[PDB]
Amino acid sequence: TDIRSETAELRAELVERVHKFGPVFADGVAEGERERRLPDATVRAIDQSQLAMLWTAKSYGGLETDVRTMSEVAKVLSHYCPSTSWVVNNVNGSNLLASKFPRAALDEVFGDAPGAKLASVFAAAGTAVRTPGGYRLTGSWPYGTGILHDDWAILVAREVDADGEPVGGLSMLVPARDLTVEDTWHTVGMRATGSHTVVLRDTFVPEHRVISGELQRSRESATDLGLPPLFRTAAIAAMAVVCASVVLGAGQAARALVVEKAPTRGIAPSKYTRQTDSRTFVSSLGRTALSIDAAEMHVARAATALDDAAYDAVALPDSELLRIRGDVGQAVSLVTTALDELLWAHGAASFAESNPLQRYWRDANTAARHAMLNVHVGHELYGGSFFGLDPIVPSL
Amino acid sequence: TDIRSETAELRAELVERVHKFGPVFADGVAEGERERRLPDATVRAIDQSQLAMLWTAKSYGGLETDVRTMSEVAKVLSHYCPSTSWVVNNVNGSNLLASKFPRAALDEVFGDAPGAKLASVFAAAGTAVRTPGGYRLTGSWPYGTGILHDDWAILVAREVDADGEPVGGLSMLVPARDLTVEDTWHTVGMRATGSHTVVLRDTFVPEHRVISGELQRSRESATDLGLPPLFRTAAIAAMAVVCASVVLGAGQAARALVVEKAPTRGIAPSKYTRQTDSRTFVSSLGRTALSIDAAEMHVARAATALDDAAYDAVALPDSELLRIRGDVGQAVSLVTTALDELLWAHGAASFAESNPLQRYWRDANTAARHAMLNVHVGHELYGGSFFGLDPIVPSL
Amino acid sequence: TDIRSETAELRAELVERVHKFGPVFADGVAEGERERRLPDATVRAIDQSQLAMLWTAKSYGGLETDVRTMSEVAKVLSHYCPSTSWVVNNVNGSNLLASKFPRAALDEVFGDAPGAKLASVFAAAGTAVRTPGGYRLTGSWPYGTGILHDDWAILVAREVDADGEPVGGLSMLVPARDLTVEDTWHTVGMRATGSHTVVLRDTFVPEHRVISGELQRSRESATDLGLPPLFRTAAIAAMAVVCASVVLGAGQAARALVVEKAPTRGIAPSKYTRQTDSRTFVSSLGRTALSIDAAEMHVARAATALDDAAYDAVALPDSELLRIRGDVGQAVSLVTTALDELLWAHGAASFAESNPLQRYWRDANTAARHAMLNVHVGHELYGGSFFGLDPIVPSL
Amino acid sequence: TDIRSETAELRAELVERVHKFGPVFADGVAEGERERRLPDATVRAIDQSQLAMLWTAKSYGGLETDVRTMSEVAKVLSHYCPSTSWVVNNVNGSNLLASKFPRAALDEVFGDAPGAKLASVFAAAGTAVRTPGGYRLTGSWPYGTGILHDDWAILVAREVDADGEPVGGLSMLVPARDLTVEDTWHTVGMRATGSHTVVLRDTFVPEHRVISGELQRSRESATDLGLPPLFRTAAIAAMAVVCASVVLGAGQAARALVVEKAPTRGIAPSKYTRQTDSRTFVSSLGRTALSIDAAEMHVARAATALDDAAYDAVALPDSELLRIRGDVGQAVSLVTTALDELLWAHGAASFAESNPLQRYWRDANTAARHAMLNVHVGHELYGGSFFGLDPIVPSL
Ligand SMILES: Cc1cc2nc3c(=O)[nH]c(=O)nc-3n(C[C@H](O)[C@H](O)[C@H](O)COP(=O)(O)OP(=O)(O)OC[C@H]3O[C@@H](n4cnc5c(N)ncnc54)[C@H](O)[C@@H]3O)c2cc1C
Ligand SMILES: Cc1cc2nc3c(=O)[nH]c(=O)nc-3n(C[C@H](O)[C@H](O)[C@H](O)COP(=O)(O)OP(=O)(O)OC[C@H]3O[C@@H](n4cnc5c(N)ncnc54)[C@H](O)[C@@H]3O)c2cc1C
Ligand SMILES: Cc1cc2nc3c(=O)[nH]c(=O)nc-3n(C[C@H](O)[C@H](O)[C@H](O)COP(=O)(O)OP(=O)(O)OC[C@H]3O[C@@H](n4cnc5c(N)ncnc54)[C@H](O)[C@@H]3O)c2cc1C
Ligand SMILES: Cc1cc2nc3c(=O)[nH]c(=O)nc-3n(C[C@H](O)[C@H](O)[C@H](O)COP(=O)(O)OP(=O)(O)OC[C@H]3O[C@@H](n4cnc5c(N)ncnc54)[C@H](O)[C@@H]3O)c2cc1C
């Protein structure tokens, strides 16, 4: 348990860093909401805290943690700024996805930049064609979380021939200098995430920064004893677990806020001048809190399954991954229902622009509908695993 | 059934008016959201359509309808602009509340103004003291829906003596010329309702425009055959039923929108490229639709109970009113849960500023937490009626 | 509204009959539970009350009511004996189904027997082959509600040729003298319904007592002005609405019982020595009661849609029938969830054999899973109607 | 982690014992249901397996495990016989409660009987009066789980003086030879548990077998390094956690059964001839499974909190105990809702006496309403902890 102790010690330290830098992130909430991008101070704090480096390899100066640590960090980050938490989660996840690329690419990205920050969008395909020494890539990729502050982007594309017929799927790593960002992110939640559209036209991408779509989604590294444990982790599932953690954390912040304010407000137009005087209020809050507790456990269970497998160098069977997909959708669904309950508890005041409760409500609800967190898809995937049905998603 | 036919004919005509003027209200949504008040064109349309006049007496040129008609109008209005619907509902309800005042006041308000529009705020008390010929009134009343466009306001206050000791409760009718409006309405939903703060300082209010709080909440007119049936209606309960209708209508619009868009969108990242191809999606939508249908029936049942009693000139017993309070909270609770479900159905796109789905979601959620719609209070009131417990609210 | 008044008067009279004969049905609950059939006194009371005759034609001495009346009768019956209610509902529904047969069959059944009682099972197919003057029928039909007391049975079969190849579907009317009943009904709920297996071997059925399966499910009589309104009703949907009413009524009886007992019991091991002293208990009960109220409205809405169409001699479109299927599944689902809630309210004592609460719980739960009440199928059917998908059931 | 490994090894061995003896328990289900007591073979198997000895001290030849082990054993036991599981859980819990008594009593109970089996009923008070050398005890105690097979019983009583005035609360240990059992357990679930009434009349109980009620509920041993860790455990909370495990396990067995049968049955009257062909069915089952998974985690979390505190010799603060009370009520509530869902999945066949599904449904539902598992009380307790309100139960 020497390593177990070490990993726990680091997690605590990282959680304490979140608390230390949290007032900066909180301070920039108003500007972020207004401008739909993270303020400069927040980006600075992310680079100084090293919170973008949790899933970066030690060989490049990264912290190289595990899923559970990243999850606990994301939950605490959300208390201060759910958008920052979301971006930080996306960066670490993108960096982890980068590890499927060759060493040549990884050196080019992380070699002189321990704090390198990647975007990744699987939400579109662009079209790529072979050229000498690489590919020529054209496309338009929406939902590019944190792309304004990112150094590189992993983009999905379809390879085509001279005729324009489909050849196969690709994953491509392209630098900020080669990208253009189009202002398309106009939403009512997660505004500062800056999930704008990445645009490429006839852009050259060399061969060493391109892998097959099959390789990008591969879980063959699960049993590779040569790799450190983090790079054995099922990456896509891990990313989904930390996205759920962002949502979860916002829900938990919402709960803490309602608890904080309940002794000094009433329930109009009742005789209950203090919320805590109403037993209906108190018992309801207990129930809502237990749903959020359940969501937390679903997330932690999935994180632990992923880490245990990576540490033991075993492959997670499909049934276990299908269950993880169910856990994450179920956790965020539980959180959105609980937020609705917390607004009923708090009252009309919760919708004031000055009240953080509506911020958590809007950010968690927006983020929860991310595709990898879809509750109905998760339900169908987990249910299907009981009978060995063909999954309804292309990769796990 | 001659009258039954007549009342149905009028309702249909009014619903058709909503459709006719609806494109104007819809057109001003963006400005209303931006400015936190209804645009001039919307106010003009409200005055031309006579939709503020449903609960104004025929003797003054009003349409003098019933609860069910007002409810059906409110539901349809919400499709075009939930804020307009909310304001229109508040105006009619305020006008109905005005009927507790003496004829002298009613003549002063409606005598040369068939389209007079009242606000009413029970959300604060101001302090009033006797002066010769009336009272001197000071206070600050938040949540003044539609006050910027209103001609008069009904405000609650506490009478006090020279010593400053409490004497009793009052309801006071004061004109726009005597009011000041303070800009305090900064919310994330129902923005165009302009529910700002009304401020009064040492304002004179004459005796004929002041009644006891007891008289304002009175239901003694329930059995008065001299009055037309609308003025026999339990007014506070009626107002709550139409507030619920505003929320309900937004929910129904949300449902229609999700149905409209489902055949041309998919469920990422599944194999379902069309939402309608997924049986999980289809059956879930059926379930969500049945909750909204239940909310509609709760609202309609309460409206019908209120109208039947007014037409028959019978008093509703307390148990029936307590049940109505439960129905309205339960209906809006059902609607907010269903909206959460509709976002899961529609996906991440629902949170774009260009998508009406998030508008219905923000407006219905904000309005649902109005005090007269509190779901937990309603549950407690209805439950209590089964055992004859003392109600937890001061008036029914 | 002369007829409207008449129909309401009859319904009240029938409801009063249920109260009059209810103590007999209640008295035989223990024997019925023990023997898995209705006691002789109960059968006698059913014949004397004429409650099996609501959907029998006036021309044969039947009461010829409508769906709403049958529904309200079923709900009240369930308070005394849910099994009796279930049987009575099945008999009326079977009698209504009989009206698709030729006049020759109807005369043979009802001509000298105004109180004739039919079974009907669509739960199996038997196999029938042409013979001169009719058919020879062999099969085994489970779930034959009330078959032990029934005079005739409507059984579904597949016609086959000499080769044994399928020809088509049939509905066959066969008398008690020709049937054999096999003891197969061993259940933990609805025990006295006696839903045993009907067995036939090479039984002759004449031509006039056989119709096509297509004719049995037909709704062509919806527009026939020659028929009285009851025989224009969509029969299968009507039967499903009254089956739901049986379940609903049991739920309502359960609610009344929990209300009755709450002031004299406590909530162990809390300080609440009286259930009514606990506000959590009271507010929860209010919520449960509103779900049951919603189930009641779903049932009533469907009944009214069916009656309005029959009275106006219009065909219900498919979308309206699909909605009715959704309403009935949703109502019974709401009732089973509410029963679970009522057990939480009442406590461990609810599971004693002496407590009627567990009887309502077991009977409503068993009956709710009847195929025509399946909640998931109803959800899929209603959801599908929004997009005009092919229904997942063969007939509506 | 040497001990951690050891404790895990023992748990696995015990779980394997449950599987070995499980066919005996399963075999006696029909007799147990019929006779309302455990069959002789089942009692024999309980004694041979040593499953009553998990919470008996090592010093007396007991297995002396922890909460988590007992919980995992209870869950697996329920698959074979929920009544046996319930009895076994009650025995271990009673044996753990016995450890508050003096060494003299413990020696008298366990000294020559490593497999001693205790009952315990807190559901009544009897009345006890001082006599020389002890007390004279009279009372009637219902809900005496497993009393027919038990060697001793812990019974709660109120001490009174000669006048008959109340003096204080007592806990009394009395042997089978001194007890009389009255046949009062007539229920529709958990029938074989034989939770009959214990009757005592003027029975002598010596001083060394009597402690104060305060001492019986005490948690002062939480920090006593002299005691083994099991006897430092918060006993009443531990007992509630394993009662919940019995219910949980029945739910899990129900889930496994529905999964097992789904490929060979259909959903009447739909086109889905195989349940697994229906995506609505599959996704619903996934959701139901995730609720049961959440219930499992709630139970495991509480077990772990209790064990970690016992091993570290720290006292659990009140807030942690209040949370455990919430977890257990919430888990069983989740299980009863999920069982309702599983019946909808399986269909009408689930209510046949031959189907194990209705057995799990009846046993889990009956046991869930035990006072220490009340969901509404748990919600109120956990909610209250957030604000430090006075708990609504007398002990934690
Ligand atoms: C706040 C927020 C931030 C987001 N950030 C990102 C991001 O940084 N990167 C990102 O890729 N996505 C991001 N997403 C989006 C997610 O991938 C989906 O695109 C989004 O939920 C819209 O789904 P849809 O059904 O509207 O998708 P669509 O419009 O259907 O997407 C189009 C196609 O992309 C495929 N697709 C979409 N998303 C994914 C995915 N995650 N993995 C694989 N295939 C996919 C689908 O199969 C579909 O064919 C974000 C969503 C939100 C709400
Ligand atoms: C969009 C929106 C529009 C609203 N418009 C109006 C409006 O036009 N007029 C209006 O009066 N209220 C309005 N309300 C408010 C409602 O009455 C409550 O004031 C509000 O829900 C907040 O309650 P609270 O618990 O924060 O209590 P507080 O606002 O803090 O209430 C203070 C006191 O006012 C009393 N009180 C508050 N509301 C009422 C009421 N409706 N009836 C009787 N007593 C009351 C309470 O019992 C308490 O004593 C609106 C709310 C929303 C969200
Ligand atoms: C208390 C109770 C009483 C019942 N009484 C009756 C009764 O009097 N008559 C009766 O027919 N059924 C009755 N049913 C049963 C119902 O029709 C279904 O048979 C039952 O729900 C079992 O469904 P399953 O999926 O196990 O049926 P299955 O065993 O799958 O049924 C066999 C076949 O018949 C078809 N089928 C079954 N029921 C129906 C129906 N109602 N309409 C059309 N097709 C059907 C199915 O599609 C299937 O192909 C009763 C059920 C219960 C619980
Ligand atoms: C299957 C089953 C098995 C049970 N087995 C047992 C058992 O072995 N031992 C046992 O004590 N109870 C047992 N119970 C019962 C439980 O303790 C409660 O008595 C029961 O839940 C009924 O509660 P009630 O509200 O009807 O209150 P009543 O039982 O009518 O309450 C009587 C008094 O006893 C007190 N009381 C009851 N139970 C408890 C408790 N568990 N702890 C502290 N105080 C209590 C209550 O405060 C109340 O003052 C069992 C219940 C079930 C359903």
Residue numbers in the entry:
A (entry chain H), B (entry chain E), C (entry chain F), D (entry chain G): 2 to 397
Text lifted from the article:
In vitro characterization, bioinformatics and structural investigations revealed that XiaF is a new member of the group D FMOs, monooxygenases that receive reduced FAD/FMN from a NAD(P)H-dependent flavin reductase and assemble in a tetrameric ACAD-fold composed of N- and C-terminal helical domains and a central β-sheet domain35. At the heart of the biosynthetic pathway, however, we discovered an unusual cyclization cascade involving the non-canonical terpenoid cyclases XiaE and XiaF22. Here we report the in vitro reconstitution of XiaF and a designated flavoenzyme-reductase, which jointly mediate a cryptic indole hydroxylation step that has been proposed to be a key step in non-canonical terpenoid cyclization. Accordingly, in the terpenoid pathway C-3 hydroxylation of the indole ring of indosespene by C4a-hydroperoxyflavin as the electrophilic oxygenating species yields a reactive intermediate (most likely the 3-hydroxyiminium cation 9, although deprotonation to yield an hydroxyindolenine intermediate is also conceivable) that is prone to nucleophilic attack of the exo-methylene group, resulting in the pentacyclic intermediate 16.
The structure of XiaF was solved at 2.4 Å resolution applying molecular replacement (Rfree=22.9%, search model: 4-hydroxyphenylacetate 3-hydroxylase, PDB ID: 2JBS48). A similar conformation of FAD has been previously reported for an FAD synthase from yeast49. This bent conformation is missing the distinct interactions between the FADH2’s β-phosphate and the amino acids Tyr144, Arg266 and Ala350. Instead, three new intramolecular H-bonds between the ribose and adenine moieties of the cofactor are formed (3.0, 2.6 and 3.0 Å). Therefore, it is unclear whether this unique bent conformation has a biological function.
